[PDB]
Amino acid sequence: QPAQTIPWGIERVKAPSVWSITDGSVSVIQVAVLDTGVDYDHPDLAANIAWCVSTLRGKVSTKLRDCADQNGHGTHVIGTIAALNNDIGVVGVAPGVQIYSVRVLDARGSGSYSDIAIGIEQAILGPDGVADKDGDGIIAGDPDDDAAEVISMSLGGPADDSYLYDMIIQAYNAGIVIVAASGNEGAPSPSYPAAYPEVIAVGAIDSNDNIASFSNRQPEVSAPGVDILSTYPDDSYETLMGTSMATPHVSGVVALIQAAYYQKYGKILPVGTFDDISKNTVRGILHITADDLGPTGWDADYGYGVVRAALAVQAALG
Template sequence: MKRLAFAGLFLGMALLLTACPTEPPPPPPPTSCIPTPTVLSAQGFGSQGVVPQGLGDFSAPHVPGELLVLPGALTPQGLAARVEGVRPLSALEGGFLRVQVPRGQERAKAEALLRAGARFVQPNYLYFPLYAPSDPLYTVSPTDSSRLKSYLDLLYMEAAWDLVRSQAYGCTPVVAVLDTVFNRAHEDAGLFLPGYNATQDGLGESNLDPSPPPSGYSYMNNDPDHGQGVAGLVAAVADNGKGVPGLGLNRVKVLPIKVFYWVAGSYASTSQVLADAIRYAADQGAAVINLSLGSTTPLDGVVQNALNYALSKGSLPVAAAGNDGTDGLMYPAAYPGVLAVGSARLDGTRSDFSNYSTTPRDLVLAPGGNQNPPQTLHVLALGRDYPYYQSPGRYVAQAGTSFAAPMVSAVAALYVAHYHAVRGQAPTVSQVKQCLIQTAANGGQYDAQTGYGLVQADRVLSDATYCFP
């Protein structure tokens, strides 16, 4: 059986890392450095005299008991006389009036003001600092370049989280993570569901511990911690003052499924085990199946069949593109129906290790670090030792397309929850994939190096064309 290669890179933290002047020309004549102003209309809404009309959006957060009114031909006193309960408070620049109305009656009074002759009425909207969770390995630090914020800013994640926090969700999507090993007792793993051991390691179906290596073999490169890191990027507990926040912001859960064990002298998985795990995840109702693993085997009918089954059950497979830095995606990322994820470094370009595809594929990017110069990001580690394996601790710095894929899985799951809250039902698998691809940074255009570009989480939760048509 062919060995499946991890799609993650386990990187260390060490850094690898004029013309001659002549006589200066005379100074130019003084000119103004002030930009040419735009000519505004009397109301302050543009040179064409276009002014808003009608009602503002009363679903957005706003100050209770206040309205902002463009009165048209009416005076403040005239408005107050025509609509009971309206009291003028102050005049604003641009011709607006701020008025007081009974709390809870903002929209009703706005409609009454329009009937009385006002041109436009809106709430006094509230603006907030973009939300940032309290997890200590999130915020930027000059002494720790692996903090998550700089990476998640590429996805506009904080703006997306603001949209998440403003909406009550009636469903909790599940992301199945098919990977190495999981420790559900970790301080940041409170959103991990009871898992499934799909391997044939003899430890039992509920045992997610590392498989005992055969005589003469041992684990290397923190391999078992891989699954915990992948799962944590989806659903590490956010805002608990510990470690890192999962991108799902406590609205998404992880179903951990162990698929790696010692087989044929390698720590790997097999077609049979992987297919069984994919089908199990789909049968458990997983909205997304994260596959941060890969093989060069181009035709695996058993796995392809399982992927088709998952798609038919409403589960979207999301798979890492691979870490060879070459043209051509690993499998299962390259299979039809799978959303492939490559890695971006901090400047938003493709990571030097990330596979790409000159053949158009359903490929997007998410942050995953870089090899040279090294860029890593903090993720969960097992934080627990075993008789035959010692974890590096509770958290570790990693890089690779393995860690880009779960970011996309988490955003996809948030979209499912948000769509359900807005429309009262879940989107189809095709809708989820179309939304993420068409709102990505390349504007719906395919590029050989970056696919459809970086996922834009804020657009995924708000776009009216492709996500909420």
């Protein structure tokens, strides 16, 4: 394996300076990545994969060959969030965070809306199959349960499926932050599920801080999405571009916020809304600590701006 290097995007979102506070390894926190699966034994990922599950064809399976990444996309996305900080490869935004790989897309990167909807449900239910095991009414942020705290969806299209949406609503109401790619058609508004109000739409910038021409407009925030090196099967590394690469940077920032907030207060922050500019919710923190590029304020290219982990965590703990 190659010596570790830090992809430009990880520095752009100001992650490394947070690690002293937390690298995401606060045990209650998991990030669920709904994608093409994961190279579960990749040396730069394996210790962070807590669950490798597939919902393809309406069958929930943890058979390794069913959950493994047969495309590369999911492994790349996961590495942006959580590649280990060690002597090899790359390093994620939250390099200590536990990951649930929820395979909702096939070897070609395609998926049915029912399989994605089931994947959302599985992020809530978690490995043990039960939403609220101790019956205390808390799901996300409860160390007695195994629900994820972030759902990261580097997938999207023009179709709005109410069954899939109802699952997103369920997750949001359980306290789970949902993050998704704005899309790559240079369209005037985001793809679904990014376009749902319960979901953070993420646009992509390049290494010059310019928004990528393919980035679907009107995102909520933006993040590195061009020339993104990350993990790839088999035990390898690859460079990709897309709002699917921007998305995990934001999910990683969210994981850091929630890990740090819990580490200090023993609870997590509420998800929040698109309009929130307070420091009382995750979304509010993301919006007010983002590097505000473009026209001042929220704008159709950058959204509220480029996410910044160090500032977000400081805001959460202040």
